[PDB]
């Protein structure tokens, strides 16, 4: 088990926006009847809309930097961004409970945008490790990605059983057999496909920097570098800052 601390790793955190896989619900006729602007909305167009996914890092319910958009990319039959966003924040400046909000947007009319979803996935998961691989976050509908702690739009909650076991397989903790796992893995793929299909919500896929300039084998871990006398005195010998303030002023 090899790892590099978050404090030492001084680069920009990068995130890949994959494909928003799901089905998008529409309104009734009366809604467009009362508000004709819905006809020209993005959702009411026959082809997939040109959505763009903003991203902002939060911490303790406080925004940590400006959001980052996705470069314009046309869509014909699917939402496949496959873009490597660069985040303003760096690894040593991410607090423990940092969480990345990701909001989808769509046109509503001249000079207006309307959120078409929202997801919030923690960066430092259990055991204080930076989440890696290809995680498929959930999509809460018609709500901007909420950054408050605890989040009101969480990303990730027998599918759970197989999620844990697959991890233990590739971390070396499992019995060794070739054909059996070669078939079982396709089985899990089909099971996950069915589970995703059944779920009514959308699901936005996302990937972290599993492969970087350094060996992929390493992982990131949260880290930081911080009877003569009985009655305590915690400032016995320091500078009198008020004295200095008065001396400097006049």
């Amino acid at each position: 088990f090899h790892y590099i601390y978050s404090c030492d790793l001084d680069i920009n955190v990068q995130l890949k926006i994959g494909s928003l896989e799901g089905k998008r619900e529409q309104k009734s006729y009366k809604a467009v009847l009362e508000d004709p602007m819905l006809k020209f909305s993005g959702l009411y167009q026959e082809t997939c809309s040109d959505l763009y996914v903003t991203c902002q890092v939060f911490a303790e319910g406080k925004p940590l930097a400006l959001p980052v958009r996705t470069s314009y990319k046309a869509f014909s039959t699917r939402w496949n961004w496959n873009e490597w966003l660069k985040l303003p924040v760096k690894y040593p400046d991410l607090p423990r409970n940092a969480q990345v909000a990701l909001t989808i947007w769509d046109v509503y009319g001249p000079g207006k945008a309307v959120p078409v979803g929202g997801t919030t996935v923690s960066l430092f998961g259990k055991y204080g490790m930076f989440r890696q691989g290809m995680h498929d976050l959930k999509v809460w509908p018609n709500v901007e990605a909420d950054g408050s702690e605890p989040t009101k739009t969480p990303g990730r909650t027998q599918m759970s059983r197989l999620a844990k076991l697959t991890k233990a397989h590739r971390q070396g903790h499992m019995v060794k057999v070739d054909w059996l796992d070669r078939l079982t893995f396709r089985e899990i793929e089909m099971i996950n496909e069915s589970e995703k299909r059944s779920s009514n919500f959308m699901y936005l896929m996302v990937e972290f920097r599993c492969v970087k300039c350094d060996d992929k084998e390493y992982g990131i871990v949260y880290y930081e570098k911080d009877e003569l006398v009985k009655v305590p005195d915690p400032q016995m010998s320091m500078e009198n800052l008020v004295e200095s303030k008065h001396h400097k002023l006049a």
Partner: protein
């Protein structure tokens, strides 16, 4: 006298049976949180400030803080006498004010005599005259008892509220004892009429009139010393008078946790800030610094 250093602290050492008496003060005044006798050539802890220096520093004791210090002086007077201890020689140079306004009464004079021959000032000059400011607060009857001290405490309070001006020098005190002198100018210098009456009552020429420090506290409960001192600050501030929160991190965390109750009662906030900052200038872990900053932001609108 000279300062020294210690493995994990600082010390003050003086060079000149009695040893047994000093340890008696160590036990008795271990319960008395606002006292500090000879911990051991005599050795003890070096405190941040003295009363005189603290008066003459850029942070300037307000009326509220001076009243609190008078309250704690009286509290130390009680705690001393209850256990069976009498200071004997109280003065501004022996009331050490820690960085968080925790008055400590130190240098319990058990070696000084009791009676001074009024025709020979040699004893005063050799024993009591150390600062050489010529201020004398020895009890007129002496020329021990709680009476002999309450007088000294009242004189110290009057001096404290007069910004270092003394109530008596040796000549003024001797004239006062004779019955042909009364410092109406110093008593008129006192900031508040309430503590002026307090000094006047504490300094009755004839000892029998002087009350106990407990009664003087009791009368002042209404206006002289606000009730908040008796109920809230006396117990709550006593937590930091021991080794439970030696680390500034723990102090800041505890104060943050209890901020809900503290704001409920407390104003005494001046003492709270004098507590927090001493923790500020030494914090080590980042969480402690952020908590201290949050505390500072919380207290700011109230100040």
């Amino acid at each position: 006298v000279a300062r020294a250093k210690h493995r994990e602290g600082l010390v003050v050492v003086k060079v000149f049976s009695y040893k047994q008496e000093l340890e008696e003060l160590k036990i008795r005044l271990n319960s008395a949180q606002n006292c500090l006798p000879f911990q051991k050539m005599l050795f003890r802890q070096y405190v941040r400030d003295n009363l005189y220096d603290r008066i003459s520093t850029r942070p300037f004791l307000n009326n509220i803080e001076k009243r609190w210090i008078a309250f704690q002086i009286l509290t130390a007077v009680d705690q001393a006498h209850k256990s069976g201890v009498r200071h004997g020689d109280i003065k501004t140079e022996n009331v050490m004010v820690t960085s968080w306004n925790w008055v400590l009464l130190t240098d319990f004079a058990s070696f000084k005599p009791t009676y001074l021959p009024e025709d020979n000032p040699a004893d005063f000059n050799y024993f009591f005259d150390t600062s050489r400011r010529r201020t004398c607060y020895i009890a007129p009857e002496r020329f021990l008892k709680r009476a002999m001290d309450i007088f000294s405490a009242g004189c110290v309070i009057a001096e404290l509220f007069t910004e270092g001006v003394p109530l008596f020098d040796l000549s003024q005190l001797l004239a006062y004892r004779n019955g042909h002198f009364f410092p109406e100018q110093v008593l008129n210098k006192i900031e508040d009429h309430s503590i002026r009456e307090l000094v006047t009552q504490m300094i009755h020429r004839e000892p029998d009139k002087r009350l106990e420090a407990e009664d003087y506290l009791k009368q002042q409960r209404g206006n002289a010393f606000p009730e908040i001192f008796y109920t809230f600050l006396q117990p709550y501030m006593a937590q930091f008078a021991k080794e439970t929160f030696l680390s500034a991190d723990e102090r800041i965390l505890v104060i943050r946790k209890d901020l809900g109750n503290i704001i409920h009662n407390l104003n005494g906030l001046v003492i709270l800030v004098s507590v927090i900052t001493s923790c500020l200038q030494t914090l080590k872990y980042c969480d402690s610094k952020l908590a201290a900053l949050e505390l500072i932001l919380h207290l700011a609108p109230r100040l």
